[PDB]
Protein: Kelch-like protein 11
Organism: Homo sapiens
Amino acid sequence: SMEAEDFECSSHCSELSWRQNEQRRQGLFCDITLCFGGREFRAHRSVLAAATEYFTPLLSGQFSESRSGRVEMRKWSSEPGPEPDTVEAVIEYMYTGRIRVSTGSVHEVLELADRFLLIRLKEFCGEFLKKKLHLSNCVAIHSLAHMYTLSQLALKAADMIRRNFHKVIQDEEFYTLPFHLIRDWLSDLEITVDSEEVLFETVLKWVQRNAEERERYFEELFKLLRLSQMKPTYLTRHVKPERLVANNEVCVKLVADAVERHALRAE
Amino acid sequence: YFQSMEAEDFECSSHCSELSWRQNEQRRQGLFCDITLCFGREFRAHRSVLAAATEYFTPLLSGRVEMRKWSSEPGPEPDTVEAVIEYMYTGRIRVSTGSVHEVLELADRFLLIRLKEFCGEFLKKKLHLSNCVAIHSLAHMYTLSQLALKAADMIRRNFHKVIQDEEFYTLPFHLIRDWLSDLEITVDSEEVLFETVLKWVQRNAEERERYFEELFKLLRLSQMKPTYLTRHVKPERLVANNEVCVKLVADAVERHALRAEN
Ligand SMILES: [Cl-]
Ligand SMILES: [Cl-]
Ligand SMILES: [Cl-]
């Protein structure tokens, strides 16, 4: 006659988190406002902290909160910041664990996911991109996989770039990359190209894309080329005559030593 | 392939249960709480969770809320309140014979329909001649139609037995009245019903003697032996002091003689 029975409402948790989301959409009981530029987003601290440890540190007072709880978001990759509909989607994801990712928003979702330590969401963006990987976007994708540490994705995109190196060079996407990547690539032994001569034509184009902030990297890039692997003809007829090479003595020196090596290896 | 896909849906199937779980861990540490329930001891909680659990809290749109007095003065047991609170956050709760009544009251007060319906099945399976009265009382006090009927049937079939226990005599007037109005109750004689009314009144002369007349009118005197009517009913103080009652006994005795010539 003694007994205790456990009652478990199977849908209860989903319903709870969905109603808190409907509450968020009307501002009900919200105690924190995420400000981006600008556009403001209300939410509940309890939910944010539950979704990610990223927000737990806001108890101590590690956020610049106005007296009505406003937190300002550090600038992002794009000045304007992520798209309003995309932020709303990531915030709603924190409340419900559901989100629709598209080719158009995947990059911003990835940035927000990375910024908020949303591991699962970030891993998902990784599979999404992994399945969309294609010669026409491997560069743009490798760039992201790197910027957001997506090991798996990185390798895959890197292989496609190696095998098709001679191709990615005629398209203008490649020339929008940042210096540290261009550098890593010239340092890559595996890249498949017809001649080292191409790599020199590539560096010129990368620099000529934005003379201003790029001409200052030429020398470090130039030192990465293997001149001993280029035809003496090209070395003296196209390399040495080039302005960026002539104006820099360390460079002209390098060309001369290379030409000297060629004659010495003449056996 | 995939070279055409423009979007995809993601759903982390365990997200919500983990979410509601961590908000429970927070509640227990007083983290991010923004409201306080009072009965006494105080309970911290989040308004967003409360409102999401039940519409009972929506109309309250770090302030303390005080809970209206309950059935028992001291109020529900601390461990029971905490369990109902945790239920709101997780949808899981352990109900026992010892706490079920207080869980029912809290569930009813907060409009936790599913919880309330559960307590109803729990009680329905524990229904027994030894508690049908206490249970019928609850099923009624909290509108448990199903439970009410079942407990009512058990009381009817054994009315002769329930009258002998003492629990029965603690019921409120409106229930005693409803029972004397019941045609189905199984008793040996209407005489017992008279003895029962006396005891109910004698239990608390003060606030009860004022109901005697309305109860007395519910008895079917025409069904009692003339012996008893004149020897035990009429001589009784409560009957004698009330003219409307002595009148009724007289008419009954008269009916008996009229129905006696055939
Ligand atoms: Cl609003
Ligand atoms: Cl894409
Ligand atoms: Cl009844």
Q: What stands out?
A: The domain at 159-264 of chain A is CATH 1.25.40.420 (Serine Threonine Protein Phosphatase 5, Tetratricopeptide repeat). The first strand of chain A starts at residue 4 and ends at 8.
